[PDB]
Structure formats: structure tokens, C-alpha cells
């Protein structure tokens, strides 16, 4: 299904922080703040020159591991974005950002995309009233994302919305902490996402 | 001789590649139409009708760029490339929707259509097609 093993080793391999854990990522004990070298026996040896294929593969793997999506789904989404009219990198980023689990992670109902996946799957999230239990559901502009009425009195949800009363969501989103409900206004822009990714490298990787 | 049009284009290419001022070609009306198209598009300065040994000839006046600085000071060309498309051994016809775009719009294609000898842009504006004579850029 998905990757369910150790997750800081992914950050150490990619050489950058992929915020895949939530609170611990901003703590001093983040593994990228203590051992910023790749895992294994040879992580502290001098790095050799990366080939072009290595560079493009690492960039694509970074982008894929940020969202925790399998390679089959990732490639299907990429081909779909390439079919659409519009700059394929921006369209691909928008399609990735429209997944329900990512949307409820950004709205603040969860602290990590993994937790957002568990929230959506376990029937705690409703889109436009009806309950949706599929992380891959694609949110269209105007859709209302919210916590189920019987799930509002949940400790995890209560704490998550408490910790977000100060934090402000992106321009492409709206949140009502009192109303416990979100709103997807438009496709996110490429500048609105603080992604350590060059999408041209991903496109060139998939041209091979 | 088998291809007067290709022969004239070859005369122009050969004379241009040595930076001559003018070149002569045996006269004909179709050749005159092609030369008029070339002059209107700025690839040549012009052309005129003269007599050599009592025979009618067309004198074409070639045009070049400014002098260049360096190891090679020969001026750059205004006719970089000229090529015949339809040949006696293979005739090429295109409809109005098969009209090629040469050099993304910097080059031209010459067409023989029922409305006359036109540039590709001219033929597209008139919505007509025909034989493809040559491409120039």
C-alpha cells in the first residue's frame, strides 16, 4: 500500500528536511539537525560526483516522498498533467496539491500527511457534508472540507485546531477554526508552495 | 537542361556564395514571377531584363550584410538557404492546410497556385494551395 518504515532516513538520504513527522520536525531532536548525512555504513564518506540520472532521480524521489504517494499513482498523475493544457510542472503540482489527505493536512486537521491519511481513511472527514474515506479523492475549487459532526469532540482534532488558531493557511485555502471547516478556493500557485523541488528535473526524468 | 527553376536557384546560390554583385540567368516568365517574389521579400535588391548575344536574360542584383570584424571579415548572407522542393522527378503539391511554415516565420515558401505565384503567407491569406516551388531563408 504505502511506505510504513523509518522516515528520518529518507530526509537524511535526500539531504533536506521533509517534514514527515509533525511536531518532532521543528524540535531540536530532528534527525536532520544531528546527523545530516545519509544512513548506513558509508554515510560519512566523501560523496562522489552525481550523474545526471542520479540528480533527476533524487529530485523526483524527494518530490514523491514529500507526499507519500506510490510510484504508480505518481506516474499516472504526471501523465495526466502532461495531457492537460497548461504548463505541465504547474499543473502537476496543482494536481498533487488537490489530494484530500494533503488538503486536510494543510487545513490543519492533522500535523502530518500520514496522520491526514489515517484521518481521511478512518471516516473522520466529510467533503460537502457527505463522508469521504479515500485519500486520493481530488478536491475541486469550491469544495468544503470539514470534520464529521460526530468527530468534532475528538481530543486529537481538538488539539490540532487549538494549535492552528494562530497559524494562517495559504491564500488558496480558507479555514474556520470555530466552524471546524475548510474551503478550497483555487488551484495553488507554484509560488505558494515552499517546495525544495525543481519540477523541470522531474519532467526531464520522465522524458527518459 | 532539365530544370530551369532549379538551375536559376543554383545560379543565385553559387553567385551569392562568392559575394558577386549580379548574376545573369536565361529569361522566362515563370522565372520572372519567382524573382519578383524574391525582390518583394527583400532577399534580392532587384532584377532587370537585358540582352546577351541578342538573347533575353534576367540580371539579378544580390544583397549582403555589413563587413564583419575578425579573422573572417566576409559579410553575412541575406539568402542563407534556398532549396527547390518540387522536381521533375517528383512533383510536390500541398493543400491550403498542408502549407509549410518555414523557419518559424523567418523563411518563406513559394507556391504556384491557380491565383498565381504566391508566398505561403499570401496563399494562406487567400485560402489556396498548389505546387511547392522552393523554400528560402
Amino acid at each position: 500500500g504505502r511506505y510504513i518504515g523509518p522516515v528520518c532516513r529518507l530526509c537524511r538520504r535526500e539531504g533536506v528536511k521533509l517534514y514527515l513527522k509533525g511536531e518532532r520536525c521543528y524540535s531540536p531532536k530532528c534527525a536532520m539537525e544531528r546527523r545530516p548525512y545519509p544512513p548506513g555504513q558509508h554515510g560519512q564518506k566523501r560523496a562522489r560526483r552525481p550523474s545526471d540520472y542520479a540528480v533527476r532521480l533524487r529530485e523526483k524521489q524527494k518530490l514523491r516522498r514529500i507526499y507519500g504517494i506510490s510510484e504508480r499513482q505518481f506516474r499516472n498523475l504526471f501523465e495526466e498533467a502532461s495531457k492537460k493544457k497548461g504548463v505541465t510542472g504547474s499543473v502537476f503540482l496543482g494536481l498533487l496539491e488537490s489530494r484530500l489527505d494533503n488538503v486536510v493536512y494543510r487545513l490543519g486537521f492533522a500535523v502530518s500527511r500520514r496522520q491526514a491519511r489515517q484521518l481521511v481513511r478512518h471516516g473522520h472527514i466529510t467533503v460537502n457534508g457527505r463522508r469521504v474515506d479515500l485519500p486520493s479523492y481530488r478536491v475541486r475549487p469550491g469544495d468544503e472540507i470539514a470534520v464529521a459532526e460526530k468527530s468534532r469532540n475528538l481530543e486529537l482534532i481538538r488539539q490540532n485546531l487549538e494549535a492552528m488558531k494562530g497559524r494562517k493557511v495559504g491564500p488558496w485555502l480558507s479555514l474556520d477554526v470555530e466552524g471546524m471547516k475548510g474551503k478550497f478556493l483555487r488551484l495553488p500557485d507554484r509560488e505558494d508552495l515552499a517546495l525544495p523541488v525543481n519540477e523541470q528535473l522531474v519532467i526531464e526524468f520522465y522524458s527518459r | 537542361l532539365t530544370d530551369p527553376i532549379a538551375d536559376m536557384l543554383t545560379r543565385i546560390r553559387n553567385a551569392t556564395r562568392v559575394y558577386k554583385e549580379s548574376t545573369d540567368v536565361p529569361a522566362s516568365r515563370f522565372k520572372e514571377e519567382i524573382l519578383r517574389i524574391l525582390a518583394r521579400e527583400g532577399f534580392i535588391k532587384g532584377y532587370e531584363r537585358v540582352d546577351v548575344d541578342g538573347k533575353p536574360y534576367l540580371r539579378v542584383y544580390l544583397k549582403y550584410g555589413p563587413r564583419r570584424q575578425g579573422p573572417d571579415p566576409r559579410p553575412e548572407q541575406v539568402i542563407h538557404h534556398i532549396r527547390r522542393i518540387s522536381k521533375p522527378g517528383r512533383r510536390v503539391y500541398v493543400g491550403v492546410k498542408e502549407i509549410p511554415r518555414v523557419r518559424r516565420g523567418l523563411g518563406i515558401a513559394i507556391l504556384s497556385t491557380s491565383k498565381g505565384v504566391l508566398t505561403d503567407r499570401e496563399a494562406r491569406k487567400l485560402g489556396v494551395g498548389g505546387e511547392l516551388i522552393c523554400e528560402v531563408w
Binding site: - | 522527378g89 517528383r90 512533383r91 510536390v92
Partner: protein, 99 residues
């Protein structure tokens, strides 16, 4: 509509029948060059008006026999023995192609 072809009479040795050589042109499907092909048709000629060298028009018709599904519609021109000569020379050249 009934197909009308135009050709030249190259054989009139049968009774009430003329062989008509019809030529057609078409561009080559892949190489683009225009090429010529020819085909012979046996055509019904009940009154035996048309002879060697005649350029005539024939029209698709009800079967008159085997191999005979066209009828001579009208005469186009006469005195075209040169086309017949081309066909006969081409046929004669085959005798030297054997082994």
C-alpha cells in the same frame, strides 16, 4: 453513376468485341511520384463500328458474358495507331525475357 472510362482499341479479333486499353495516373502512396498504369477491358461492340486505333469511351453495363461487363458508349477520335504501336512493341518485347 455508371463508370465511364476512355481508352484506345488495341484488339478487334473477336466478333462484336473490342479490347480497350485504359490508362490511369496516381501518386505513389509512399514515394509521392505520379505513376501510370494501364488495364485492358473487353467491351461489347454489336455493330462492329470501331476498329484498331479508335479512341472510344466505354461504360459499365450488365454482364454480356464472362470478362465482358462494359459497353462502347461513343467514339472520341480516330487514327491513333501510335498508342497501338506502343502496346504491340511492349507485348513483343516479352519474347526475349524468357530463360
Amino acid at each position: 453513376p455508371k463508370k465511364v472510362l476512355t481508352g484506345v482499341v488495341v484488339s478487334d479479333k473477336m466478333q462484336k468485341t473490342v479490347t480497350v486499353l485504359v490508362e490511369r495516373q496516381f501518386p505513389h502512396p509512399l514515394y509521392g511520384k505520379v505513376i501510370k498504369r494501364s488495364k485492358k477491358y473487353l467491351a461489347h461492340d454489336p455493330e462492329e463500328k470501331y476498329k484498331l486505333g479508335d479512341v472510344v469511351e466505354i461504360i459499365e453495363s450488365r454482364p454480356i458474358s464472362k470478362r465482358k461487363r462494359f459497353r462502347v458508349l461513343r467514339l472520341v477520335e480516330s487514327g491513333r495507331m501510335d498508342l497501338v504501336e506502343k502496346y504491340l512493341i511492349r507485348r513483343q518485347n516479352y519474347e526475349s525475357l524468357s530463360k
